[PDB]
């Protein structure tokens, strides 16, 4: 196979979703920090360039009416990546795309917390993308973890799926964000919540005809500043293991992450319109929206009746290995440190990526 960038409209072919319905019958959310004005222009460029019907969007000011929802320029790249990858992975159609904008002028992490809260209180988006995070110990120290976990618990109970990127620092999430730290390993919040689907990252190889070839762990090593670029994965030091993860034997009594993984290597990343220009972008920030778009298709195939899927993923995939592409090669550290991929569930990549048509057939037969 070859490593190259991909138009997001290629993700259905790659993950075997072409025979599924589009997400035209499912509403999807994206959590953002600040506004999305340029992102909506980039989204217009995206659907128009690809010859697709336009996407119905709404932007939601989730905090104070007098908050700061100005565009964050760097942020627009993230909301571009998220929106274009969702719509591409969804087959080119979503019922509506809702941008839940965090106020930037709010104290502490309260703007972000209120963005999550609004998405749950409104309960209109079935699937919500979160391509962000930070050291879980930091979130824990200031009470943000506890506050936000309550919101995600309510989401899961009401049948909403939050998808959360596992991180881009490999095992070194709490070490100056990504500086190698030997055997000291850590994870990202909110991926470590048991109430969300945590999504890790792969290196995606395709055949010359554009079909799936194989996936390895996302690990692109150190950048010029000496920071590691790799999939987050490991276990929470705070969150207890939810019962469905007991199928992964020989692991501690903690929430293990990620659950599943999709394309994240920049070298195999998505081609995204950003301030009018095409850029090749990776990260677990890519992997999460691919899951969101694909999962939204399965919702549309099932009348939006699929509840929070963590328990079902673990029972189905452990008993049915054909539902995934099992990542077996690579590690999410540096210098001989970090976790290794292997057969079945592993810390870099979880169960690996989903084969959507096979998963769809499984759900038809067994439910989810």
């Amino acid at each position: 196979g070859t490593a190259k960038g991909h138009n997001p409209t290629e993700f259905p072919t790659i993950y075997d979703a072409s025979s599924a319905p589009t997400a035209a019958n499912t509403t999807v959310g994206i959590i953002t920090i600040g506004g999305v004005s340029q992102t909506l222009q980039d989204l217009q460029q995206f659907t128009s360039a690809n010859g697709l019907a336009s996407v119905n969007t709404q932007t939601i000011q989730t905090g104070s009416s007098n908050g700061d929802y100005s565009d964050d320029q760097q942020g627009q790249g993230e909301w571009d990546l998220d929106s274009q990858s969702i719509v591409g992975s969804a087959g080119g159609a979503v019922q509506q795309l809702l941008f839940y904008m965090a106020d930037q002028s709010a104290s502490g992490n309260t703007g972000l917390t209120q963005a999550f809260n609004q998405a749950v209180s409104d309960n209109v988006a079935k699937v919500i993308n979160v391509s962000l995070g930070w050291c879980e110990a930091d979130a824990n120290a200031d009470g943000t973890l506890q506050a936000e976990d309550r919101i995600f618990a309510t989401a899961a109970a009401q049948g909403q799926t939050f998808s959360v990127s596992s991180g881009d620092e490999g095992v070194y999430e709490c070490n100056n964000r990504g500086y190698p730290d030997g055997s000291t390993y850590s994870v990202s919040w909110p991926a470590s919540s048991p109430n969300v689907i945590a999504v890790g990252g792969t290196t995606l190889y395709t055949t010359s005809a554009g079909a799936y070839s194989n996936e390895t762990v996302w690990n692109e090593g150190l950048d010029s500043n000496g920071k590691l670029w790799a999939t987050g994965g490991g276990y929470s030091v705070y969150e207890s293991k939810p019962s469905w993860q007991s199928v992964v034997s020989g692991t501690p009594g903690r929430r293990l992450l990620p659950d599943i993984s999709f394309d994240a290597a920049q070298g195999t990343g998505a081609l995204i319109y950003n301030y009018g220009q095409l850029q090749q972008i990776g990260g677990t920030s890519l992997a999460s929206p691919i899951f969101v778009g694909l999962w939204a298709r399965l919702q549309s195939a099932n009348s939006n009746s699929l509840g929070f899927p963590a328990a079902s993923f673990y029972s189905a995939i452990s008993s049915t290995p054909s539902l995934v592409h099992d990542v077996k090669s690579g590690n999410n550290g540096y210098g001989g440190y970090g976790y290794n991929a292997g057969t079945g569930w592993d810390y870099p990549t979880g169960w690996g990526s989903l084969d959507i048509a096979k998963l769809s057939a499984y759900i038809r037969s067994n439910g989810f």
């Binding site: 920090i33 760097q74 942020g75 790249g77 993230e78 992490n109 972000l112 391509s131 962000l132 995070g133 930070w134 990127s165 596992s166 991180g167 881009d168 964000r177 990202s188 990260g283 677990t284 920030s285 999460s288």
Partner: peptide, 4 residues
């Protein structure tokens, strides 16, 4: 936080 960080954008991933």
């Amino acid at each position: 936080x960080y954008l991933y």
